[PDB]
Amino acid sequence: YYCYY
Amino acid sequence: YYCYY
Numbered sequence: 001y002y003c004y005y
Numbered sequence: 006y007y008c009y010y
């Protein structure tokens with residue numbers, strides 16, 4: 001999965 | 006923050 005910060 | 010699964 002991937003996350004934006 | 007938000008994550009794509």
Ligand SMILES: *[C@@H]1O[C@H](CO)[C@H](O)[C@H](O)[C@H]1O
Pocket residue numbers: none
């Ligand atoms: C997340 O955003 C970037 C641009 O910041 C890019 O379009 C990636 O493909 C996306 O997953």
Ligand SMILES: *[C@@H]1O[C@H](CO)[C@H](O)[C@H](O)[C@H]1O
Pocket residue numbers: none
């Ligand atoms: C994550 O992706 C969705 C896809 O429908 C949408 O562009 C949201 O604005 C983005 O944050």
